[PDB]
Structure 1
């Protein structure tokens, strides 16, 4: 966290910095998107 790193998740890839936030993902949701179809949030597949 707080470091420029790459991402290889179960269903998400890219490059960026991870930070804690107040967002919430449903139990049937993994990763979010903004208005421009770009990812701006993700839930960890192992931790809650």
Structure 2
């Protein structure tokens, strides 16, 4: 976290910095998407955070 990496979640590969979100995801959500139709948030499988 707070470091640059090649991420993958579920096959949603990419590149970025991961950081703990204060986005109050409703329990059924696993993604957030930016206006660009690019992901900007993810709910980890092993850790809900």
Structure 2, unmatched stretches of 5+, are: none
CA RMSD in angstroms comes to 1.4
Structure ranking higher in strand proportion: 2
Helix, strand or coil at the partner of 1:40:
strand
TM-score (norm 1): 0.78
Aligned residues: 48
TM-score (norm 2): 0.77
Structure 1, unmatched stretches of 5+, are: none
Q: Where has structure 1 moved over 4 Å in runs of 4 or more?
A: none
